[PDB]
Amino acid sequence: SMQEEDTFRELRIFLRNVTHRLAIDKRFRVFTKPVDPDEVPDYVTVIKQPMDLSSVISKIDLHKYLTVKDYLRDIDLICSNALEYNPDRDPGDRLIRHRACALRDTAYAIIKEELDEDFEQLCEEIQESR
Amino acid sequence: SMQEEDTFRELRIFLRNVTHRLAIDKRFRVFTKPVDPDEVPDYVTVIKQPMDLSSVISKIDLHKYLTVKDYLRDIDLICSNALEYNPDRDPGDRLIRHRACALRDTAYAIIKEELDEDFEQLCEEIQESR
Numbered sequence: 001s002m003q004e005e006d007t008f009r010e011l012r013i014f015l016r017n018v019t020h021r022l023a024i025d026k027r028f029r030v031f032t033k034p035v036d037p038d039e040v041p042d043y044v045t046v047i048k049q050p051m052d053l054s055s056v057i058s059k060i061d062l063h064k065y066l067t068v069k070d071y072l073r074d075i076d077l078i079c080s081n082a083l084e085y086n087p088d089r090d091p092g093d094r095l096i097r098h099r100a101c102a103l104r105d106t107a108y109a110i111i112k113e114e115l116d117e118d119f120e121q122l123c124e125e126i127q128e129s130r
Numbered sequence: 131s132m133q134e135e136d137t138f139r140e141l142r143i144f145l146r147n148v149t150h151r152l153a154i155d156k157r158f159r160v161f162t163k164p165v166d167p168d169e170v171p172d173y174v175t176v177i178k179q180p181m182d183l184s185s186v187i188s189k190i191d192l193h194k195y196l197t198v199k200d201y202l203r204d205i206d207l208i209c210s211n212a213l214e215y216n217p218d219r220d221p222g223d224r225l226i227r228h229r230a231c232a233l234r235d236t237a238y239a240i241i242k243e244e245l246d247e248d249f250e251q252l253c254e255e256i257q258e259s260r
């Protein structure tokens with residue numbers, strides 16, 4: 001219905017705003033775009049589902065997220081990919097892992113403060129009906 | 131169940147084989163990998179969901195296709211993207227559009243000859259039950 005279309009449109013607006021706020025944070029610059037294959041040639045083979053914030057934006061615009069829960073799976077993916085690909089004790093790996101966890105924590109904190117639980121429940125019940 | 135897991139495993143095997151046969155065809159080399167942004171800088175802005183045969187393989191391996199119908203949507207996407215991005219009368223555009231339609235026709239012809247309709251129906255009914 002038109003009312004359900006309005007619901008998903010509001011969701012997309014909410015998700016774009018959260019994603020933009022993450023993307024403009026200097027700490028998360030490394031997650032803003034797909035990895036440069038020249039800098040990490042084995043990334044494509046090691047990480048089976050790459051994810052980044054520009055890709056998240058594209059997925060929002062393609063109507064791929066019907067719930068905030070689905071969105072948070074991709075945010076979690078950005079984080080888990082970073083922990084998987086950069087597991088070492090060296091400062092470089094530890095920096096990106098810290099930033100990865102900070103990205104996840106920040107996304108979850110924004111959603112906790114700004115997502116209405118009844119709005120999310122509505123989205124879930126529309127998703128389940130289809 | 132284990133029987134349903136076997137069904138989707140057979141599907142993935144079937145889809146990998148079809149995709150490999152398309153990928154080794156010289157005509158379809160242009161569709162084998164994501165576009166080089168240096169050669170087509172405006173592609174990312176013009177084409178909202180890029181698709182290619184290496185990405186199709188990754189999606190198979192990530193269990194993204196539960197039916198051959200879902201697979202054929204991405205094959206159709208490779209084709210429609212080519213018709214959208216290369217619409218002109220020039221020989222270059224007409225060549226890639228011909229190859230795009232040939233890729234689609236070839237995928238559909240292989241599936242018509244080699245996909246058992248009862249196998250596809252089973253996949254669809256498992257997909258619908260979830």
Ligand SMILES: Cc1cncc(-c2ccc(N[C@@H]3CCNC[C@H]3OCC3CCS(=O)(=O)CC3)c3[nH]c(=O)c(C)cc23)c1
Nearest residue numbers: 030034035036037039040081082085086090092093095096
């Ligand atoms: C400008 C740029 C463009 N494309 C990719 C990189 C990069 C480069 C190296 C990585 N991993 C290295 C694996 C081996 N040990 C050191 C690690 O680099 C640490 C470095 C710290 C600073 S940063 O800005 O967080 C980038 C990663 C990466 N590891 C990653 O997980 C990602 C997402 C990127 C990355 C950088």
Ligand SMILES: Cc1cncc(-c2ccc(N[C@@H]3CCNC[C@H]3OCC3CCS(=O)(=O)CC3)c3[nH]c(=O)c(C)cc23)c1
Nearest residue numbers: 160164165166167169170211212215216220222223225226
């Ligand atoms: C080696 C390589 C790597 N990455 C991208 C290209 C490329 C380059 C140009 C395109 N479109 C042009 C737009 C303007 N008019 C001429 C068109 O090129 C025609 C050319 C014919 C030969 S081919 O091998 O089919 C590549 C396309 C493309 N148009 C496309 O749709 C795709 C998928 C690719 C492409 C080539």
